[PDB]
Ligand binder design. Sequence first.
Ligand SMILES: Nc1ccn([C@@H]2O[C@H](COP(=O)(O)OP(=O)(O)O)[C@@H](O)[C@H]2O)c(=O)n1
Ligand SMILES: Nc1ccn([C@@H]2O[C@H](COP(=O)(O)OP(=O)(O)O)[C@@H](O)[C@H]2O)c(=O)n1
Ligand SMILES: Nc1ccn([C@@H]2O[C@H](COP(=O)(O)OP(=O)(O)O)[C@@H](O)[C@H]2O)c(=O)n1
Ligand SMILES: [Mn+2]
Ligand SMILES: [Mn+2]
Ligand SMILES: [Mn+2]
Ligand SMILES: [Zn+2]
Ligand SMILES: [Zn+2]
Ligand SMILES: [Zn+2]
Lengths: 157, 157, 157
Amino acid sequence: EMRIGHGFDVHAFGGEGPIIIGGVRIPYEKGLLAHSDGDVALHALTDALLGAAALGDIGKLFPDTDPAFKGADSRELLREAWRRIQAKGYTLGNVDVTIIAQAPKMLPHIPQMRVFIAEDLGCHMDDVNVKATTTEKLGFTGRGEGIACEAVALLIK
Amino acid sequence: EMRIGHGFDVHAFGGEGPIIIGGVRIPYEKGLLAHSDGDVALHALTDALLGAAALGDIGKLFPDTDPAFKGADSRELLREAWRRIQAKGYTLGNVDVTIIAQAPKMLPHIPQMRVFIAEDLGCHMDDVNVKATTTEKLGFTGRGEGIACEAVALLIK
Amino acid sequence: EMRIGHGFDVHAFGGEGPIIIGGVRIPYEKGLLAHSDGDVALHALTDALLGAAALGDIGKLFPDTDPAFKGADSRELLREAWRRIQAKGYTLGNVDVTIIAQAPKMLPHIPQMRVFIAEDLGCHMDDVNVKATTTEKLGFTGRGEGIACEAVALLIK
Ligand SMILES: Nc1ccn([C@@H]2O[C@H](COP(=O)(O)OP(=O)(O)O)[C@@H](O)[C@H]2O)c(=O)n1
Ligand SMILES: Nc1ccn([C@@H]2O[C@H](COP(=O)(O)OP(=O)(O)O)[C@@H](O)[C@H]2O)c(=O)n1
Ligand SMILES: Nc1ccn([C@@H]2O[C@H](COP(=O)(O)OP(=O)(O)O)[C@@H](O)[C@H]2O)c(=O)n1
Ligand SMILES: [Mn+2]
Ligand SMILES: [Mn+2]
Ligand SMILES: [Mn+2]
Ligand SMILES: [Zn+2]
Ligand SMILES: [Zn+2]
Ligand SMILES: [Zn+2]
């Protein structure tokens, strides 16, 4: 059996760079604001994975009032979600992530995100794809207020 | 054979609450403007299912020209779509919905949404996932202008 | 093996019509600005297909920088991407595209887009769905500033 999931996330710019996306530190004039590290790509991916498994979403796994994972980096959260998904009997088919950002340029950093994601999910780098697009200066991303990310995932059981 | 579909919808706030999302009435300071009940979750889901089956979109199935569904609630629209999709020989793999709203909070209402959706599609609740995310006060969702929803579905033949 | 992919694109209105969407010329008071024909639907679809095949994105394959692709139209790019994907051993499962635009009306033009996509991917028209939705005058699409498109694809290996 196969299952599909989808995730979407947005974080706002604020503070000083670098930003962290896909587990990779990217120099930039502004940072990403969040209680968390603000890794919009890993949050969206985590939600797609949890969604395919019908385990809810990242907020449901890591409640605001829960002290356990407060302070954790997003790679840690991805690995723990993944542990809980595998405990339900699933393995990974493949994942695809789309970063929506006017800047910074993501392409040079995409290879390194793929390695980190592949290590965290214990899969082949050929099962992991990441891309980026701008919105041609339109909307909150085009005005440089923040970054959004969409992801989809296919799990096998 | 398995087939994938994707849906997206947006409705604007207007008037007084409550709003209806995933078939669940939720109290709020404003209502959702729409000829229909404005249920963005169910419209996005209906489009994702129609999309997987290559049956077009909710506008093609329910034109303003057809009186049968004028004024029908969105659950009735989802069920008629599901009938057409089943007539094509499909059964449900799984669905995942992502509500994009700064407010109201969706978490406590999601259990009921899952039950209503599972009822409408004749499946187990474990084949239905619903999550939500804010856009951190950015964009028309972040400013509280309206609500958006994305959905993916996997059908089996 | 089955594999999923997702794509998203945006282009801004500017210049004279028509606009070109899914390979179809649609009359409109403005065109879509781009170094290209600005076909958001085909770009998003090309990205979903490349994504499923873990080949990156249209910008990795066809950099706006490289003269080899100067003046290529979006169908030529979709076909070349498809050529590369098939060379990797994949065949088409199905694709679903969602155009997000306040105007012009897409519905009358969608059947032709389906034909063109099916021709370019060498598949049956029934493996290709295209839909449209407005955002109810909200956001950059609602204000008539640009058009967005999301797509998903399922490939078989
Ligand atoms: N309208 C909404 C928005 C999000 N939420 C929940 O609140 C959690 C956090 O939302 P957020 O948009 O602040 O997420 P982050 O990437 O900051 O963790 C989500 O993961 C959902 O559990 C909700 O229930 N209702
Ligand atoms: N640019 C557009 C937008 C929507 N549509 C069609 O119009 C219908 C209604 O779009 P809408 O955004 O008003 O949809 P609702 O969720 O209000 O029903 C869609 O289902 C499509 O069939 C279109 O043909 N062209
Ligand atoms: N923040 C971003 C956005 C896009 N890109 C890359 O830049 C290319 C072109 O982006 P774009 O938004 O102008 O795309 P199109 O005009 O080609 O549809 C993308 O296809 C990615 O390869 C990036 O690396 N960093
Ligand atoms: Mn409408
Ligand atoms: Mn947050
Ligand atoms: Mn561009
Ligand atoms: Zn986040
Ligand atoms: Zn709607
Ligand atoms: Zn484009």
